């Protein structure tokens, strides 16, 4: 139904881009609701697809999570990396900020002025986060205000509000994170999320507070299972769980941890 694109390889996963060229479109700052944003595009993607959003941490940029446009537009996916209103907003406004601008996405693609015109199923809505915008992406999360989550390194005030979630949820943690730190963060936010919901943790040996934002030497991994998450919960593609559910993921030097509730 919504599957696209070739049979996935462990090779064709790792790869820095899926086999979709792409196009960007900039979105102003004047945009109602969140402080911008760069749209990531496959060109020549027939129908509707599933749409992303990718928000930054605190005082930080939406560059520094651009490696998420790429990787996952030439996928078969319309990403919009954003700016908040502030770099200094915390969680619960950049929650707010995630839904309007899935919003502004949805809006845009029954726009007839818009490069996007006819691209997104409202119906398939995701958010990937770093520290204080996975935070966002996780209370998101807690309303079921979108159909797939991945927090990268992430940072909250509490776990409490996310024991209820059944949005299906990545969490990448640093292990070595002296910011958001796994054993105060990630590793409580994965362990409040019930039983009963898809979840994956994936914990990066040495890793530090940036070492889920990509661009840097862990892009294989990252993409690998980020594509794969979104593919199998945004697309409902069943080719991309055997890349989470089965392999030993720990037997890479780069996994520390690994904790999941496959089968899905
Ligand atoms: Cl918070
Ligand atoms: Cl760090
Ligand atoms: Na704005």
Redesign the pocket.
């Given at each position: 139904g919504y599957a696209r694109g070739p049979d996935p390889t462990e090779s064709f996963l790792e790869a820095d881009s899926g086999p979709y060229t792409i196009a960007t479109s900039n979105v102003s700052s004047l945009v109602r609701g969140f402080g911008g944003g760069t749209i990531y595009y496959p060109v020549n993607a027939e129908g509707t697809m599933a749409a992303i959003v990718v928000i930054p941490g605190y005082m930080s940029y939406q560059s520094s999570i651009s490696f998420w446009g790429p990787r996952l537009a030439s996928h078969g996916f319309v990403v919009m990396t954003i700016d908040t209103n502030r770099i200094s907003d915390?969680?619960?406004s950049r929650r707010d900020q995630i839904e309007a601008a899935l919003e502004y996405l949805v809006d845009q693609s029954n726009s007839s002025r818009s490069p996007i015109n006819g691209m997104v199923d409202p119906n398939r809505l995701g958010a990937v986060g770093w520290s204080?915008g996975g935070?966002?992406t996780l209370?998101l999360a807690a309303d079921d205000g979108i159909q797939a989550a991945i927090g990268l390194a992430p940072?909250?005030?509490?776990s409490l509000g996310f024991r209820s979630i059944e949005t299906p949820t990545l969490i990448f943690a640093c292990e070595r994170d002296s910011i958001a730190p796994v054993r105060s963060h990630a590793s409580p936010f994965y362990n409040a999320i019930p039983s009963s919901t898809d979840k994956a943790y994936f914990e990066i040996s040495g890793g530090n507070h940036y070492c889920a934002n990509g661009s840097n030497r862990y892009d294989a991994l990252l993409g690998k299972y980020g594509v794969a998450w979104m593919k199998l919960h945004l697309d409902q593609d069943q080719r991309y769980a055997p890349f989470l559910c089965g392999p030993n993921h720990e037997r890479d030097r780069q996994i520390s941890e690994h904790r999941s509730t496959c089968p899905f």
């Open positions: 915390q969680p619960p204080m935070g966002g209370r940072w909250n005030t509490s």
